[PDB]
């Protein structure tokens, strides 16, 4: 049988302080006991300050993390410009993610 | 009467007159040209230059179908890229089920079975273009040329648009003049000298020459634009024809 | 395109009627004539075939009177082949309200439902509506007899007799002249023949012009019966009442 | 879902100082037998790309029709199609992943692992991975089935990370591939002699050679080999 | 005259009439401008208010970080066009990684445009666009009618009294399209342009409307005070 | 008066957007004729190539519909490639649905049956084209059938199309009322070819050459349309007799 | 493209008539006359084979068709329509009947199907109605011989004996005084022949002339032996020589 | 399908099919409408040109949309009882969703959305029927009543009339209706709306049909003799 | 007859030109946008004093920080409305915040030129939506059945129309406060009426960053009329 999830491990974490904050993570990848890459980069800068990870299955990661940036385009389009708040993005994350309710993106995020 | 108000209306005499004033947009249009070769076919076309803002050798109109036809048109210039993206279609479909390129007959018939299909209901307009068409198969050189009606036959030269009794003539000429057959780069000159001669009709603005060629020697049976030393050197000879 | 053909028959005239549905009922009124009468123990239905021939197989032959179960009937008035197909339809809502509930449709919610039909045909769809007026004959348990009437427009009311096709200002002054409330079955089948004999464009009343048909609690004990006279039986039925 | 029939093994590759190199054997297996001798299993698609393929023969040969494809969709209404506009590493690859990915998440993947290699328009080296799942990665050495756990090692001895690229010469580059290869065939089932190799450089540009073989092999030391113990 | 009640019907000497039609709801609409160099191409707008307590008609819309147009006509038009063009711009980048070609956006506005113009039911696009954009064979600006017919220019202007700017860039020809690495000079030659189309009314601040996109500089549009600078 | 712009009855019961298209029919200025001999169908027809840049080879109104089957149109060329296409695929669908080859007469009927659908329903126009298809069916023998735009067909021992048909018609008909038979006596296909290129000079009064004419001939198992050379001899032997 | 005309093109006119049926009926009119007669034991249907070319060859042109083994069919108007008719009824009586109830449908029922398919060209979008009148004649077992005739608006009648097209309006009177409830079959068949005679201006013989009946059961038409309830179609097309033998009798 | 745009703007702005369905509604019987201060009064017209009639079967022309709320009309008669289908399954909708019975402005605003929906939707014609809905809200005794019509516009009214000689009924209602005190009983009300009837109507035998809303579900329709005995008091007291 | 999206020779569409001939026939309304607030107020226009002037609903809530004022056929309107308040729903949903004013507008608007041979006619009634968002503070815009909008610091819809948006012209400045608005949107409404103006026949409302959009009370209106008339006798 045809099975359309996978690991590439990796490990993420973010840290919120009181006037900045941090989206940390390692740079490995892999499948089983092989090592894909030694640097493929995971956390990335989505545009208006924001900082998205979304660590597990890396193609659905990618998907993910791919469609967030193009909303955050479509957000300038339609909204004269405004800058997407942070809060607004994570609520907007929410109905990228459970839109997947029966066929999820395997992945844990964090922005 | 009201006969000529729809499509896919015949009037008393037998005539379909909303194809008819499809043919006078035609009419219309700049001229454009096809030459059968000896191993190829040769295309070309007046641009009219209506200002000295337009980009010179940006505007083509020239289009490739797969890698192996040309297709150039005059008349309603959209019309006639519709008829094309339709035609590169066909020549996929061709090629994904039967693996070879399509041949230009083929060709030729799928393009006419559409525009026909345009003259049966009166929801849907005629194509404002002719369209003159060829390339290399694997049974030599082919030209065409497809009319409004759908009506397509195959040439040993085409012209069509304003200055189309011109061209004809010319071509009527090499015809006579040479029944052995015209090289690929001599037709690259001649053309160059038809659309030069037939833009006595199109004689207030001046204008740029555009030609293509598909020759089994001189490009492999592919589709390519005539380009720097080789357009130059057939715009030279045009120019010492008309003086 | 395709607009400049359109006749559009679902719109307002300035007066607010609708073209089709007028138009419609005038080509009703050339129709044969036919009549329904409701007594107090039954309903009659007579109607008259139009201009026929000596060589029309009549015994055969059914242009007016319909059965749509075994406690509805109909006549009709209007274009045959319309009316067959809504009579078809009739036929299938009363054995779906059959298979559903397990009891016999009730003879307003088959009237409801056709006319709900023949209103559609008026408001959408651009298609032309059924020239086709119905007079419906039939008994329940709630109501008892009734008689209703529709038509193109897809209104129907309720009657104790009525007419429709032919003369039916003429006919319908004749009813409205002799019918009574405690009348009976046999006394509306002599009202309905007379009303038809001088309503009649034809010379004179035979019975090979005739179709005629009783719904009648004479049904052994407490149960309905439906009759649709044979050419014989309306022939004694003429003699009987003084007419031939 | 399916399973694959036809199928093709290993594909190497690894990026040096101006370039990148990508080798894959000749065979296609059916099973355990060894059926088609004489597949190519490295496409080119224009001067400046190499899509290497492993995995299944047809869903690979459907792959090679929509690049085929994909030239000739370019060319349309296209005067620069073999210049500024032409097709890049970068849009071959994007274009893959895109079609891997849908195909996986309508449970009907395309049983492939693609590494596509090639130089970019300002010179820079691209090397990425894509898979049935529609992952990807890039690394500068990659490889596919055993050449992951067998090729990798020795070509990251050559280039362990990304400041080694420079240091390392096509000649260096292109023996190591070619050692792989034969470690390859020495211990990998369903595999072959016969290869294919393309380097992909920025001056010299793209070199397709055919018809190689796995040749220097160590087999003399098997005579002194007797019984089990 | 009988050859006018719909799209799908050509007139006896081959006219289409509600096509040309559609053509006359441009030039009743506001003037624009487009030109460009070899760096850096410019739109330069008139945007028309209703009254003196209204707000003036954006003219400019961005299609991409590289691409945008500006609008004469139906305004509503304009945003179904561009909402196209930038549906195309984004699938070029998701698919291919690739940034969508000037010419190649043109082709597609042109095919959009054309399927309305054959058709019963619906009508022409009633609405002219001005497309400017720096790709990989740098500057272009592209000038698209709802005929269909998308052309490739140095310099031009459409919409009402646009042949007053049309024949001072066709003398301005040679000097403006050597503004390379200038900016501000670009725009200058698009301010100085469209000024030849005015008539009672004058560039003020609220009334200007300028978009520019070049080699280092993504697809900007400036209004209001950032336009004081070119009055 | 919108009852001539579409497929709807007149007042006197016409169908006046059939009748044009009858006319259309004629827009070619072509004839053609056919005949039935004892072992094949000969069917041939004028050929006018008018300008010198056409390319002659491709100017036909002659198509070969099965291997058995052979069609010849009266009519535009667009509507002629319409129905041939059409006529084409329903053939190839009808073997590979019920196992053997489509009859002549039945293909006739199919397309017939097409054409009188655009007679009845209004979004369609009909074809302003006359369909002869010939072939030697395995049952019935040599066979012609011809549609026109009404939707009517019928099977013929001969038949003739065109501006001059009447003419044509007439000279076969007197043919037939002296040999009293339903087709030309004669074993060869080439000489059957002969007497309908001879009866065609007969009743229209001109004279051929080899690419003034285009002829079809079908056999058992195929049909096959003759080259100008072919042609050719065929005039020779007509002149040296 | 598209089927946009999804309204109707026959409309009720102010005076209540419905035009295109009107017209179609006037088509009708002008075609060549067909007929019908019951006998006690049998029902005959007939018409000219009017031939449009004496190249063409008649025997081809079917215009008395076979519906089902015990019912016929014969029109007058365009034949094109009534050839698409008898397609569909054809069908229709095996759709609608036989694979539901294992055997054919009787006369009047596949009459109004037929009724039906031709009302809806009535009222449905974007159609004309049918240009014929048929003229249907059948036996089942529990109805007996039957004859119907069908008009473009859908409406059907019995018949004792009829005839529609050309001259049926003197044809019908010649009826009249001949048929009687007494007929034999081959009495009908001399009627027939009779009455189709003062219609028919040129040749009047076995081959301008197609004649069927609905009679008895033809056991040796049937194709089979060995199942004793299937004794064959009551259908039967008259031969040419059939016909002149009938003519010399006349 | 058929897509014909059949109700569009005319050059002086007006929609004609729209405006002509409103003529079909002057043509319909008188329909009347009076609201007291415990309950609310329909009144209708009979026409007496159908005699002969079976009025135990007919249709009567106010209909029950749910326990609580009532719909009386003037216009086309086929076309009303499409709207009326509609209102009683969406009454029963409400219940099934919200647990509770429709309000009479909720009811009211669903009939005359529908009315509006076919006056901008493609291959239809707007309906010709003009409505007065009335009856109580749920575990409330402020009575209500509202109109419609055909171009979809609703409102409240503490009195009105549509159908043929509305004209006249509306004005003697705004002469004889005084808003600071409403009918305060049911004999009041009926006597109200009979007398605006009578105005109009011709016989007062069975050409006035009289139906009673009262709180909680309370609806009944009066009789010819209970009618008969409105019409006989109101013509006594006339003659003075 | 003729198509429905069909050009006319001045380059117009027909059916867009003719629904705004029926907007001129609808019932006046006004908005004032001031910094402060700002104000809606429409004319109620009832047909008849029997018609419970209370239920005519002309000013309409979209969301707490939008408001609405409609002019014309107002059957139209409902669909209109229903539209603008699931768009403004939905983007909270989506976005958690609320919606620009705007982007609301915009949202309407986009519905406006969905007709063909979809609805089968544009709309026959314009609106006036005001509101206050952070990014561009308290707004005014008019949104047409053609598709297009324009923001205004004042504008006047309906039969009284360019008779008020005169008066709009001398009387708007920069400064006025919200109390001024008020008293301004009744006294051109005033102006305009044929009836004379009160509480039951006309109608204010207003919305404020603070407080949101409210309908005011006849109550309310009713003191500042009695304010208006004092004021223009003082002088
Ligand atoms: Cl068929
Ligand atoms: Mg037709």
Request: proline share 3%.
């Amino acid at each position: 049988q045809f099975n359309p999830y996978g690991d590439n491990g990796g490990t993420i974490l973010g840290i919120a302080g009181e006037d900045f904050a941090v989206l940390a993570g390692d740079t490995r990848n892999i499948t089983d006991y092989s090592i894909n890459s030694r640097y493929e980069p995971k956390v990335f800068d989505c545009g208006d300050n924001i900082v998205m990870s979304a660590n597990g299955f890396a193609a659905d990661g990618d998907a993910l993390v791919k469609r967030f940036k193009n909303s955050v385009k479509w957000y300038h389009f339609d909204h004269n410009d405004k800058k997407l708040s942070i809060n607004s993005a994570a609520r907007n994350i929410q109905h990228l993610l459970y839109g997947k309710r029966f066929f999820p993106y395997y992945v844990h995020t964090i922005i | 009467t009201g006969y000529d108000l729809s499509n896919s209306v015949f009037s008393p005499d037998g005539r379909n007159f909303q194809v008819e004033y499809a043919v006078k947009a035609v009419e219309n249009g700049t001229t454009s040209i096809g030459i059968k070769c000896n191993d190829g076919v040769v295309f070309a076309v007046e641009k009219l230059i209506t200002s000295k803002l337009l980009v010179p050798q940006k505007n083509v109109k020239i289009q490739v179908v797969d890698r192996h036809i040309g297709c150039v048109y005059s008349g309603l210039i959209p019309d006639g890229r519709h008829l094309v993206n339709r035609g590169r279609e066909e020549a996929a479909s061709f090629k994904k089920l039967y693996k070879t390129p399509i041949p230009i007959p083929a060709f030729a018939d799928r393009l006419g079975q559409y525009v026909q299909a345009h003259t049966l209901y009166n929801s849907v307009r005629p194509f404002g273009v002719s369209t003159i068409f060829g390339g290399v198969d694997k049974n030599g050189a082919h030209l065409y040329m497809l009319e409004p009606s759908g009506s397509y036959w195959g040439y040993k030269g085409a012209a069509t648009g304003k200055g189309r009794q011109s061209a004809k003539a010319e071509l009527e000429k090499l015809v006579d003049h040479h029944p052995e057959g015209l090289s690929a780069r001599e037709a690259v000159k001649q053309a160059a000298k038809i659309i030069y001669l037939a833009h006595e009709d199109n004689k207030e603005k001046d204008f740029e020459l555009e030609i293509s060629w598909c020759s089994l020697s001189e490009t492999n049976g592919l589709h390519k634009f005539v380009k720097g030393d080789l357009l130059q050197e057939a715009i030279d000879f045009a120019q010492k024809e008309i003086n | 395109g395709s607009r400049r053909y359109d006749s559009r028959t679902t719109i307002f005239s300035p007066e607010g009627r609708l073209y089709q549905v007028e138009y419609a009922l005038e080509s009703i009124s050339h129709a044969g004539t036919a009549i329904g009468i409701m007594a107090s123990d039954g309903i009659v239905l007579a109607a008259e075939r139009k201009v026929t021939s000596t060589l029309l197989e009549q015994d055969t032959s059914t242009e007016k009177l319909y059965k749509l179960n075994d406690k509805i009937a109909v006549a009709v008035a209007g274009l045959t082949a319309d009316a067959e197909i809504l009579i078809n339809t009739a036929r299938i809502h009363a054995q779906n309200y059959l298979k559903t509930y397990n009891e016999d449709i009730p003879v307003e919610i088959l009237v409801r439902r056709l006319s709900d039909i023949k209103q559609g045909y008026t408001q959408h769809g651009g298609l032309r509506p059924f020239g086709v007026s119905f007079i419906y004959a039939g008994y329940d348990d709630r109501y008892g007899y009734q008689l209703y009437t529709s038509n193109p427009s897809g209104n129907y009311t309720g009657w104790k007799a009525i007419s429709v096709g032919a003369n039916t200002s003429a006919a319908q002054t004749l009813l409205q002249m002799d019918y009574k409330d405690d009348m009976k079955v046999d006394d509306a089948i002599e009202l309905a023949l007379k009303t038809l004999s001088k309503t009649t464009d034809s010379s004179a009343l035979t019975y090979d012009r005739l179709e005629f048909a009783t719904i009648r609690k004479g049904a052994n004990d407490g149960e309905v019966y439906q009759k649709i006279f044979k050419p014989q039986e309306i022939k004694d039925i003429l003699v009987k009442t003084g007419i031939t | 879902t399916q399973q694959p029939i036809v199928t093709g093994t290993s594909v190497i590759s690894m990026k040096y100082d101006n370039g990148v190199i990508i080798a894959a054997d000749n065979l296609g297996s059916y099973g355990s037998l060894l059926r088609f001798n004489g597949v190519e299993r490295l496409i080119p698609v224009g001067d400046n790309t190499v899509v290497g393929i492993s995995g299944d023969i047809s869903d690979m040969q459907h792959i090679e029709r929509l690049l085929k494809d994909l030239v000739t969709e370019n060319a349309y209404d296209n005067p620069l199609a073999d210049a500024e506009e032409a097709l890049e590493p970068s849009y071959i690859f994007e274009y893959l992943a895109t079609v891997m990915y849908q195909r996986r998440s309508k449970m009907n993947p395309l049983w492939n692992a693609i590494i596509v290699a090639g130089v970019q328009s300002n010179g820079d080296q691209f090397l990425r991975y894509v898979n049935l799942l529609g992952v990807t990665y890039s690394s500068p050495t990659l490889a596919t089935g055993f050449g992951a756990h067998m090729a990798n090692p020795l070509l990251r001895k050559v280039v362990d990370r990304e400041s080694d690229i420079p240091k390392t010469t096509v000649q260096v580059a292109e023996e190591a591939i070619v050692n792989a290869m034969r470690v390859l065939y020495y211990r990998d089932a369903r595999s072959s002699r016969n290869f294919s190799l393309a380097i992909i450089d920025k001056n010299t540009g793209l070199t397709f050679k055919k018809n190689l073989q796995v040749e220097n092999m160590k087999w003399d030391f098997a005579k002194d080999i007797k019984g089990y113990g | 005259n009988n050859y006018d009640g719909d799209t799908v019907t050509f007139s006896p000497t081959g006219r289409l009439f509600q096509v040309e039609y559609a053509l006359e709801a441009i030039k009743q609409g506001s003037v624009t401008v487009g030109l460009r160099s070899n760096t850096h191409a410019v739109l330069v707008a008139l945007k028309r208010n209703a009254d003196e307590l209204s707000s003036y008609q954006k003219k400019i819309i961005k299609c991409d970080e590289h691409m945008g147009l500006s609008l004469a006509g139906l305004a509503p038009d304009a945003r179904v066009l561009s909402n196209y063009l930038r549906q195309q711009c984004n699938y070029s980048s998701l698919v291919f990684n690739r940034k969508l070609a000037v010419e190649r956006a043109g082709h597609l506005l042109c095919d959009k445009a054309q399927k309305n113009t054959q058709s019963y039911g619906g009508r022409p696009y009633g609405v002219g666009l001005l497309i400017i954009g720096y790709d990989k064979s740098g500057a272009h600006l592209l000038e698209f009618q709802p005929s269909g017919n998308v052309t490739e220019l140095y310099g031009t202007a459409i919409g009402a009294r646009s042949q007053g700017a049309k024949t001072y860039l066709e003398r301005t020809l040679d000097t403006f399209i050597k503004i390379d690495g200038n900016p501000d000079e670009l725009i200058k030659a698009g301010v100085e342009a469209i000024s030849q189309s005015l008539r009672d009314e004058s560039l003020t601040v609220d009334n200007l409307s300028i978009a520019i996109v070049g080699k280092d500089t993504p697809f900007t549009i400036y209004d209001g005070e950032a336009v004081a600078k070119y009055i | 008066g919108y009852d001539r712009h579409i497929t709807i009855f007149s007042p006197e019961g016409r169908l006046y957007q059939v009748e044009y298209a009858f006319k259309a029919t004629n827009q070619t200025n072509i004839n053609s004729l056919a005949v039935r001999g004892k072992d094949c169908t000969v069917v041939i027809s004028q050929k006018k190539v008018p300008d010198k840049l056409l390319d002659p080879t491709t100017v036909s109104y002659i198509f070969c519909i099965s291997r058995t089957i052979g069609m010849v149109v009266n009519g535009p060329i667009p509507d002629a490639r319409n129905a041939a296409l059409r006529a084409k695929a329903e053939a190839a669908e009808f073997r590979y649905k019920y196992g053997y080859d489509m009859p002549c007469d039945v293909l006739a009927k199919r397309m017939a049956n097409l054409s009188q659908i655009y007679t009845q329903r209004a979004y369609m126009r009909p074809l302003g084209v006359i369909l002869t298809f010939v072939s030697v069916d395995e049952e019935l023998g040599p066979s012609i059938y011809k549609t026109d735009p009404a939707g009517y067909y019928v099977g013929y021992k001969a038949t003739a199309t065109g501006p001059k048909q009447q003419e044509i018609t007439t000279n076969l008909e007197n043919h037939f009322k002296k040999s009293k038979i339903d087709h030309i006596n004669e074993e060869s296909w080439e000489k059957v070819v002969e007497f309908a290129i001879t009866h065609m000079i007969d009743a229209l009064g001109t004279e051929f050459s080899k690419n003034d004419l285009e002829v079809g001939v079908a056999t058992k198992d195929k049909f096959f349309t003759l080259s100008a050379e072919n042609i050719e001899e065929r005039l020779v032997a007509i002149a040296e007799q | 493209m598209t089927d946009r005309y999804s309204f109707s093109l026959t409309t009720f006119s102010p005076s209540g008539k419905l035009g295109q049926i009107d017209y179609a009926l006037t088509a009708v009119k002008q075609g060549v006359t067909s007929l019908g007669i019951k006998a006690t034991n049998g029902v005959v249907i007939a018409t000219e084979k009017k031939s449009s070319s004496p190249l063409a060859m008649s025997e081809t042109l079917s215009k008395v068709s076979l519906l089902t083994p015990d019912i016929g069919a014969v029109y007058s108007g365009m034949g094109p329509d009534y050839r698409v008719l008898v397609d569909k009824s054809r069908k229709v009586a095996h759709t609608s009947y036989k694979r539901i109830y294992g055997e054919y449908p009787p006369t009047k029922l596949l009459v109004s199907e037929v009724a039906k398919i031709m009302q809806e060209a009535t009222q449905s979008g974007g159609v004309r109605p049918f240009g014929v009148s048929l003229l249907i004649a059948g036996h089942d077992e529990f109805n007996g011989f039957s004859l119907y005739q069908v008009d473009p608006s859908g409406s059907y009648f019995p018949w004792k004996a009829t005839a529609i097209g050309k001259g049926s309006v003197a044809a019908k009177t010649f009826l009249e005084k001949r048929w009687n409830d007494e007929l034999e079959l081959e009495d009908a068949i001399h009627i027939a022949l009779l009455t189709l005679k003062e219609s028919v201006e040129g040749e009047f013989n076995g081959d301008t002339i197609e004649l069927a009946i609905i009679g008895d059961e033809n056991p040796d038409l049937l194709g089979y032996t060995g199942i004793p309830t299937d004794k064959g179609p009551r259908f039967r097309k008259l031969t040419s020589q059939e016909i002149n033998d009938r003519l010399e009798a006349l | 399908g058929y897509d014909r745009a059949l109700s569009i703007f005319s050059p002086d702005g007006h929609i004609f099919q729209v405006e002509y369905a409103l003529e079909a509604v002057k043509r319909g019987t008188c329909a009347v409408g009076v609201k007291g201060k415990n309950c609310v009064v329909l009144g209708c017209e009979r026409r007496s040109t159908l005699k002969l009639q079976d009025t135990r079967i007919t249709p009567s022309k106010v209909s029950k949309i749910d326990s609580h709320v009532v719909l009386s009309f003037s216009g086309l008669n086929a076309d009303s009882r499409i709207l009326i289908e509609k209102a009683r399954v969406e009454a029963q909708s409400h219940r099934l969703t919200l647990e509770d019975p429709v309000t009479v402005e909720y009811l009211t605003r669903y009939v005359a959305g529908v009315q509006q929906r076919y006056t901008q939707s493609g291959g239809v014609r707007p309906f010709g029927v003009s409505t007065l809905i009335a009856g109580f809200d749920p575990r409330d005794d402020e009575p209500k009543l509202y109109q419609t019509e055909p171009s979809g516009i609703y409102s409240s009214w503490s009195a009105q009339t549509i159908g043929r000689n509305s004209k006249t009924v509306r004005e003697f209602l705004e002469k004889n209706y005084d808003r600071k005190e409403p009918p305060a009983t049911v004999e009041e009300c009926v006597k109200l709306t009979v007398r605006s009837l009578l105005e109009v109507v011709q016989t007062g035998a069975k050409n006035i049909e009289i139906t009673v809303v009262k709180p909680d579900s309370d609806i009944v329709a009066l009789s010819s003799e209970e009618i008969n005995q409105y019409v006989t008091q109101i013509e006594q007291e006339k003659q003075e | 007859d003729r198509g429905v999206s069909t050009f006319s020779p001045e380059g117009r569409l027909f059916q867009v030109e003719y629904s705004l001939e029926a907007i001129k026939l609808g019932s006046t309304a006004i908005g004032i946008a001031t910094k402060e607030g700002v104000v809606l107020g429409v004319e109620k226009r009832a047909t008849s004093p029997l018609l419970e002037s209370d239920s005519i609903e002309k000013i309409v809530e979209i969301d707490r920080h939008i408001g609405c004022a409609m002019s014309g056929l107002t059957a139209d309107a409902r669909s209109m409305i229903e539209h603008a308040r699931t768009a403004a729903v939905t983007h909270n949903l989506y976005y958690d915040e609320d919606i620009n004013v705007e982007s609301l507008t915009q949202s309407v608007c986009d519905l406006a030129l969905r007709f063909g041979e979809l609805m089968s006619r544009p709309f026959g009634v314009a609106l006036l939506i005001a509101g206050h968002d952070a990014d561009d503070g308290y707004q005014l815009f008019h949104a047409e059945p053609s598709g297009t909008f324009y923001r205004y610091n004042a504008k006047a819809i309906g039969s009284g129309s360019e008779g008020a948006q005169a008066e709009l012209l001398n009387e708007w400045h920069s400064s006025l406060t919200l109390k001024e608005a008020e008293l301004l949107v009744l006294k051109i409404l005033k102006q305009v009426m044929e009836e004379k103006l009160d509480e039951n026949n006309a109608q204010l409302s207003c919305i404020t960053k603070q407080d949101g959009f409210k309908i005011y009370d006849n109550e309310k209106t009713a003191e500042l009329i009695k304010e208006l008339k004092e004021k223009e006798a003082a002088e």
